[PDB]
């Protein structure tokens, strides 16, 4: 989810792709992520091109986590469920909002809900595409590099726009 500009927007929906329309100057993406019965993350990111490279620069602040809840207690499985990102225009900010729910698998067969609220606003002042309501269908696979001893994550993600 940090670089939604790489979603595949079908040709028939290309007039709804805010994310690429803000490039190269980019957009600011902000989120509040609320973990049910636990703390929250607030994030601010700038997504823009630096030369021919797409850069996602993020500051994350997490507060009010429980010392031994599922997050600081590391009780979440190393996997990831498919989900939809529901997008709506925010015409007053020349950008978009999104709302979705992530379900993190807990090692005991339970689920840790993470409510996501997101806003994006362009960095540049050129025209952007303000979309009709739609969603991004996201699939993610997490793995490890067998030769890597540092703490790390390998991520494969597919994101397809749909709903119109």
């Amino acid at each position: 989810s940090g670089v939604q500009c790489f979603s595949r927007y079908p040709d028939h929906m290309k007039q709804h792709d805010f994310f690429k329309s803000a490039m190269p100057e980019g957009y600011v993406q902000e989120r509040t992520i609320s973990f049910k019965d636990d703390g929250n993350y607030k994030t601010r990111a700038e997504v823009k091109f630096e030369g021919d490279t797409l850069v996602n620069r993020i500051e994350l602040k997490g507060i009010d986590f429980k010392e031994d809840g599922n997050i600081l207690g590391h009780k979440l499985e190393y996997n990831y469920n498919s989900h939809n990102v529901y997008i709506t225009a925010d015409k007053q900010k020349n950008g978009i909002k999104a709302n979705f729910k992530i379900r993190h698998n807990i090692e005991d067969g339970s689920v840790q809900l993470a409510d996501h609220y997101q806003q994006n606003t362009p960095i540049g002042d050129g025209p952007v595409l303000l979309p009709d309501n739609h969603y991004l269908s996201t699939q993610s696979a997490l793995s490890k590099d067998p030769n890597e001893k540092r703490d790390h994550m390998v991520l494969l993600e597919f994101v397809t726009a749909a709903g119109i």
Binding site: V3, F6, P24, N56, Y80, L155, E157
Partner: protein, 62 residues
Amino acid sequence: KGEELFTGVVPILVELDGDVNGHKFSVSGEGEGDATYGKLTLKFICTTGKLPVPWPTLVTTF
């Protein structure tokens, strides 16, 4: 116009600085994206030591 920058494979850099309950950390990631296939491949490294939260909780941020 912006869409034109995405018709091929694009290198991606990700840089995060975090503070969760006073645990400070940084993550650097590299990979590439190919929007034609809505496909992203990235590898993230915690450069400050051990990640103080579970990796899955940062996927949507990255």
